[PDB]
Structure formats: C-alpha cells, structure tokens
Structure 1
Amino acid sequence: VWRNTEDEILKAAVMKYGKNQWSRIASLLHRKSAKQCKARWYEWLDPSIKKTEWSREEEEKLLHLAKLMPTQWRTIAPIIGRTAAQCLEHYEFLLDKAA
C-alpha cells in the first residue's frame, strides 16, 4: 500500500514535474510503478477531491441517481463531484442508517 513518507515524496515529485510524466515519478519511487502513482494521485492525493461532509442536496441527488442508474458508480460520481469510491461508501452508509 502507501505510507506517509512515499505519499509526500509523490506530492513533491508531481508538484515539480507536472501531472503527466508518470514514468519518471515512478522512477523516483522505490517499488512503485506509474499505474499506482497515477491512481494514487487521481483518487487520494489530488486536492480537488474533497473530504468533507455531505450537503443534504448532495445526498438526495446521490440517492436519486443510484436509483436511476444502479451500480454505475464511475458514471454517477462526476455528476455529483466525489470519487466513485466515496459515492459508493456513502450510499451504502445511507442505506444502512435507514436499515
């Protein structure tokens, strides 16, 4: 997986080189490859991904979609602005709070 040290070495590398030179950033990292680099940045370390609490309209929209287009999380997520893993966990979480 990923550890504070590597995450910060990543942060530094990216912020220097730019966000499409994945192979050199991979080369900076010992035992990490460009697939994992790209994934990590675009899901957890990108600062346009927000880790806050859900507006009520966010949530009501969430449930509206997850009923419209069931199990298509990559398609749903951008229509509300969190990553699909966030959307998925919060949808099960609302389902279970109302369970």
Structure 2
Amino acid sequence: LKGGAWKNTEDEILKAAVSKYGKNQWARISSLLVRKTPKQCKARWYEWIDPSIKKTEWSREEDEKLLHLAKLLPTQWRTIAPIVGRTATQCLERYQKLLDDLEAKENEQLNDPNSRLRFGEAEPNLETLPALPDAIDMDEDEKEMLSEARARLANTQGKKAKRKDREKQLELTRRLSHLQKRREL
C-alpha cells in the first residue's frame, strides 16, 4: 500500500526532486513517489538524505560531547542532536551501542537489558535506515515511476503554456496553406 523500505531508486528520485522543487513542496515531490506520503518524504530528507547529515564514523570529541549531553538532559534527544551535530536517531543509536559495548567488555571481567530482553528486538525506524541496494531487474513498476519522474523533472514550461505555442504553430500552418494555395493559383 503505502510505506515500505525506501529502495535506492526512491532515494535518488527524492534527491532529484529536492534539486528541482525545493524543501517546501513535499506534496509535489511525493507525487513522484506513488508508494510514499509527503510526511514520509520530509522525514527521510530531514533524517537520512540531506547532505548536512554526517554519516562518517564518530570522532572522539563528538563522542564525549554526546556522553556529557546525554548525562545532562536525560532522554530529550531532539535537543541533544543539534548540540552534538548529528541527528537524534544517530545519537540514540550511538549511545545504545556504547552502553552495549561497555556491557560486552564488562562480561570479560565479570543497566538491565533484561527488561529490553523480555520482549523482542527493536523494530527499526523505516525512515532512518539505509536505502536497499537495487536489483538488476528491480521488478517493473519502478521503471514506470522512473519514466514518469524523468518526464516530470524536465517538463518545465508550466502547464497551460502548451496552448499558445500550439496555437502559433497552427496559425503558421494555416497561413502557409493559404500562401501555397495562392501560389498554385
């Protein structure tokens, strides 16, 4: 239906649509992607796609900054994220990884994930995951949406400006016919 896993083609069409349209026309961008909603497109752009996100490995300075902030403001990742420099989901996942790593290094020499163990694993948030690599024949509906997107990105010329040029062409054809009739007369 709607949603999914953000295949690489969808991410690329999102980047091109932001190139051509801007960051304040998410409904128009989401018209390109049949399987996604404007909220989902905006969420992916602001959570994964936009170039401002630093997807590189964690430097040590930002790691200690993250530790200090996570101590200062318990929870509250949406405000920790701007100060750290990464996104909120990145900060939360990094903090959880540090806690799990400390527990693993603790086990060699010897937090209650048992509460988190009593249930299943955390279901990953769809918009924050890396895009699925595309298959050689990535089905066929994607080709259809790619063709529509390609026609969309370069169409330009407005919508109803196609009437005036056509009318000029028809007038040129009719005047050419009139002149040709006169010369054959």
- Normalising by structure 2, we get a TM-score of 0.52
**1:20 has 2:24 as partner:** yes
1:31 positional shift: 2.1
Aligned twin of 1:82: 86
RMSD: 0.9
Task: Describe the superposition over 1:54-76 as per-residue Cα deviations: whole angstroms up to 9, x where unpaired.
Answer: 11111111111111111111111
Aligned length: 99
Deviation of 1:96 (Å): 1.7
Q: RCO greater where, 1 or 2, for CA within 8 Å and sep 6 or more?
A: 2
Write the letter of the residue equivalent to 1:66. A
| Gap runs ≥5 in structure 1 | none
Is the counterpart of residue 4 in structure 1 residue 8 in structure 2?
Answer: yes
Q: Letter of the aligned partner of 2:27 in structure 1?
A: S
1:49 maps to 53
Structure 2 unpaired stretches of 5+:
104-185
Distance 1:12 1:67 in 2: 40
In structure 2, the residue matched to 1:36 is 40
% of aligned pairs identical?
A: 81
Q: Give the whole-Å Cα distance in 2 for the aligned partners of 1:11 and 1:74.
A: 24
The CA distance in 1 between the partners of 2:61 and 2:36, in whole Å, is 39
Q: What TM-score do the two structures reach when normalised by structure 1?
A: 0.94
TM superposition outliers: structure 1 runs of 4+ over 4 Å: none
1:97 aligns with 101
TM superposition shift of 1:81: 0.5
Question: C-alpha displacement at 1:92, in angstroms?
Answer: 1.1
Q: Provide the C-alpha distance between the structure 1 equivalents of 2:77 and 2:71, rounded to a whole number of angstroms.
A: 11
